[PDB]
Amino acid sequence: NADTLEGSMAQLKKGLESGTVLIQFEQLYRKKPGLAITFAKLPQNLDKNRYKDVLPYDTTRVLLQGNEDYINASYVNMEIPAANLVNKYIATQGPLPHTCAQFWQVVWDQKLSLIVMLTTLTERGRTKCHQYWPDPPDVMNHGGFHIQCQSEDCTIAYVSREMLVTNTQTGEEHTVTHLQYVAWPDHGVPDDSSDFLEFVNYVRSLRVDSEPVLVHSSAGIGRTGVLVTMETAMCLTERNLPIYPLDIVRKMRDQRAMMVQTSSQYKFVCEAILRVYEEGLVQ
Numbered sequence: 001n002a003d004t005l006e007g008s009m010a011q012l013k014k015g016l017e018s019g020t021v022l023i024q025f026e027q028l029y030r031k032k033p034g035l036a037i038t039f040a041k042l043p044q045n046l047d048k049n050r051y052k053d054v055l056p057y058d059t060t061r062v063l064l065q066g067n068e069d070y071i072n073a074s075y076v077n078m079e080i081p082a083a084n085l086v087n088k089y090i091a092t093q094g095p096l097p098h099t100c101a102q103f104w105q106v107v108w109d110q111k112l113s114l115i116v117m118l119t120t121l122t123e124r125g126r127t128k129c130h131q132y133w134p135d136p137p138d139v140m141n142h143g144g145f146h147i148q149c150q151s152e153d154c155t156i157a158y159v160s161r162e163m164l165v166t167n168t169q170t171g172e173e174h175t176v177t178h179l180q181y182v183a184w185p186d187h188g189v190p191d192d193s194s195d196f197l198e199f200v201n202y203v204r205s206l207r208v209d210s211e212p213v214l215v216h217s218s219a220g221i222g223r224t225g226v227l228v229t230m231e232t233a234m235c236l237t238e239r240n241l242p243i244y245p246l247d248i249v250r251k252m253r254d255q256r257a258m259m260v261q262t263s264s265q266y267k268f269v270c271e272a273i274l275r276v277y278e279e280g281l282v283q
Contacts, residue, residue: 001082001242008242009277016270024246025266031257035059045070048102050093054219060255062090064105071102072220074256075212078232078248083239088212089228091256093220094119094129101143103132107176107214108145108165114206115163116215117180118223128186128218133163133178144168150175157183157195177206186218187261189226189268197272200230225252225259226269233273237280245270 003011015021031037039045040055049055049072056062062073073092080086090112095103107115119128133149134140140147146166153160161178181199183191190196207213217223229248236243245266252259260266 002244003242005237005240005242005277008244009274012243012245012270013274016267016274021246021270022263022267025249025260025263028246028250028253030253032057032254035254035257037257039070040072042070044068048072048096048099050096051219054093054221054258056256062092062106064102065109068102071099071106073106074220076228076252076255076259078228078251080232080235080239080241082241083235085235086210087207087231087235088210090212090214091220091224091228091259092214092216094216094218095132097130100130100132101145104142104145104147104165108167108174110212111174112212112214113176113208114203114213115176115178116203116213116227117178118184118215118217118227119180119186120182123186129216133161141168157181157190157192158199179203181223184223187222187265189265193268193272193275196230197276200227200234203227204231204234219258219261221256221258222261222265225249225261226265228252229260229269230272233269234276237273237277243273243277245273 035057037055038058048070056072056074060075062071063069064071073090076089076091078087121129121131133147136149136152146168148164150162150164159180163176163178165174165176183195215224215227229245232248233243249260
């Protein structure tokens with residue numbers, strides 16, 4: 001629309017070399033002015049936030065059934081209008097010991113079939129996420145759900161697990177694929193860009209149309225934003241549609257604040273976009 005895909009990529013490359021592109025990223029607002037954040041700060045919800053200042057907007061937050069409706073999680077939907085396509089996500093923080101029940105409730109309510117976890121449980125002494133699933137063959141109970149891990153297979157950059165969730169009240173069962181990317185430091189970039197691109201292609205292969213993919217990290221913003229940005233760009237490149245990563249980031253941030261944390265994360269994702277564009281031309 002504004003340019004060809006070819007043209008947008010020339011602009012991106014030029015902008016990375018110069019490098020105006022990183023400047024513009026830093027000028028972008030982190031939170032959208034004018035979206036209320038109030039439920040996240042209610043006294044009863046404060047201990048449900050892993051990070052005090054990483055909070056969902058009222059309008060896009062995920063609602064739970066009942067008295068305590070709050071979870072730190074956001075609907076993030078990425079539109080490719082020129083293609084009649086919307087990639088749905090739920091972006092959320094790493095569950096705390098006492099929010100595991102709410103996490104699984106969200107998976108259950110929406111019968112989500114894919115969880116993408118972009119963090120290790122700990123990093124140099126520092127807790128990043130609670131282990132909300134059991135080591136096989138142990139079983140785990142969270143808020144009336146029985147969780148078991150049916151399989152656990154490792155690769156160099158990520159672990160793949162099949163999980164069986166049983167509603168203990170009704171006996172109803174739900175299977176979820178759980179992918180944990182372990183080779184990606186908080187506030188940093190993937191250790192290996194090729195392993196990252198293989199992982200993103202794998203996530204795309206598991207996506208079901210009109211069903212959200214649950215993506216989380218520790219805060220649910222930095223690494224989560226990079227993944228969403230990459231999947232979006234991959235859809236655009238295949239469709240010969242122009243890619244403006246600053247606009248992709250802004251559109252994410254209008255749904256969950258602070259997505260893509262660092263200029264180095266942004267730089268990485270832009271370089272990876274150029275790489276997949278170039279490979280797409282070779283087919």
